[PDB]
């Protein structure tokens, strides 16, 4: 069974947040429950609501007037609508459901970050953190990409279309004084590989539909 959230990353204050969860591997009409749980950045889990086998719904009392959970049997999906949102609704929203037996683990979606803000979408610029003697330590070199000036979170970064994972560090974004996010992703590799191995960072910023594959080549430095 797999669950997968879909929906917009940025929502303006007072508008309605709309998310969907597509279910595959199981009938939506055979769930013990389907529901939603959110997690504000750096905080814990908060249940939003659930729909039971009959279609009966139960919502968090602090959210009840703003919540609707519904099922679409033809699409085998369920949804969340949260109206009149404010900055306080910014969170990673998970869909979840229980299938097969009452003692089974629930299945969870991947989580989708929804930011509520009056600011607007902005795609990142991607700049190379190119290796040189200054980023060499013994026989090891560091290289990376700087993903600068985007909004809202998140951006995802991979290296070499996923073939390079060892020694990769993708840092949590920082919010700059400008109100835009930036982050870097770095990797350490053998210095001997700099002349023969291609290093490409793959950057995706879903809210702006920005995808960039940036080759990071060694600099010419005479220090």
């Amino acid at each position: 069974v797999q669950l997968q959230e879909s929906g917009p990353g940025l929502v303006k204050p007072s508008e309605t947040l709309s998310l969907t969860c597509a279910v595959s591997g199981y009938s939506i009409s055979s769930g013990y429950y389907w529901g939603w749980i959110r997690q504000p950045p750096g905080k814990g889990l908060e249940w939003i609501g659930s729909i039971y086998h009959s279609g009966s719904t139960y919502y968090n009392p602090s959210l009840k007037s703003r919540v609707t959970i519904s099922v679409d049997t033809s699409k085998n999906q369920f949804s969340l609508k949260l109206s009149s949102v404010t900055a306080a609704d910014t969170a990673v929203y998970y869909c979840a459901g229980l299938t097969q037996s009452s003692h089974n683990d629930a299945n969870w979606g991947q989580g989708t970050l929804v930011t509520v803000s009056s600011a607007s979408t902005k795609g990142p610029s991607v700049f190379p953190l190119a290796p040189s003697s200054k980023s060499t330590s013994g026989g090891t070199a560091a290289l990376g990409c700087l993903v600068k000036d985007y909004f809202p979170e998140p951006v995802t970064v991979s290296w070499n279309s996923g073939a390079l994972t060892s020694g990769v560090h993708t840092f949590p974004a920082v919010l700059q004084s400008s109100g835009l996010y930036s982050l870097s992703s770095v990797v350490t590799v053998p210095s001997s590989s700099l002349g023969t191995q291609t290093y490409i960072c793959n950057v995706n910023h879903k809210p702006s539909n920005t995808k960039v594959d940036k080759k990071v080549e060694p600099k010419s430095c005479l220090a």
Binding site: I37, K43, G44, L45, E46, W47, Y58, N60, P61, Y94, A96, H103, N104, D105, A106, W108, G109, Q110, G111, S125, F127, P128, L129, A130, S132, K134, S135, T136, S137, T140, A142, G144, L146, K148, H169, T170, F171, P172, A173, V174, Q176, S182, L183, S184, V186, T188, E217, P218, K219, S220, C221, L222, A223
Partner: protein
């Protein structure tokens, strides 16, 4: 909601407990579950019905409940156990409620950082800004000090730091510090230096460059 300590720490191979404090109306009257949340992932259930392990969960994980509190135990700690742990139960309306989470840090030996510095790319300078990045790689413990100097002037307020989650394989941290200048300001100074202090270093490590030594590939 339920109450958990914010963090716990122990060495590999040791045991830890994490306890969840609730009330008569939630834990007192209901079953407790526990969840592991690795960074960037959904929660994964470890324990349900107070003490039962789902299929696939090893017996390193155990749970119990007493009165209005519950406890998760983890033995044989592994570096992969670094995570946030949550209790969950049901309230007087039989709605799910969760604790605030407990971060588990794995202790390891002191490891000094390797330090790397990145002069801004010509590409970025063409766009009007210079970001200078100092990387502290694979160190422990998490505490580290980074100071920027530009022509020997100590920088205060114009840099930002980010630190990774604990590494799942070697239990270290990494840190970036980014100094941001306009192009015009960048072109008024020569020497860019980051100085790093850490328990694992017997004296501070400085990495530096002079503007103009490099050109893009």
């Amino acid at each position: 909601v339920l109450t958990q300590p914010p963090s716990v720490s122990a060495a590999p191979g040791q045991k830890v407990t994490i306890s969840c404090s609730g009330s008569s109306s939630n834990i007192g009257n209901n079953y407790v579950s526990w969840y592991q949340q690795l960074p960037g992932t959904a929660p994964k259930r470890l324990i349900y019905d107070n003490n039962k392990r789902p299929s696939g969960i090893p017996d390193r994980f155990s749970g119990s409940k007493s009165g209005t509190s519950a406890t998760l135990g983890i033995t044989g700690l592994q570096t992969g156990d670094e995570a946030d742990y949550y209790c969950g139960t049901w309230d007087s309306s039989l709605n799910p409620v969760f604790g605030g989470g407990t971060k588990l840090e794995i202790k390891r030996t002191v490891a000094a950082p390797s330090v790397f510095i990145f002069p801004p790319s010509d590409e970025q300078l063409k766009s009007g800004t210079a970001s200078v990045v100092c990387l502290l790689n694979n160190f422990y413990p998490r505490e580290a000090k980074v100071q920027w100097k530009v022509d020997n002037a100590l920088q205060s307020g114009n840099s930002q730091e980010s630190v990774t989650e604990q590494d799942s394989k070697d239990s270290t941290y990494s840190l970036s510090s980014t100094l941001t200048l306009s192009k015009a300001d960048y072109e008024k100074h020569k020497v860019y230096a980051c100085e790093v202090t850490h328990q694992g270093l017997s004296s501070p490590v400085t990495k530096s460059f002079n503007r103009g030594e490099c050109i893009d590939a």
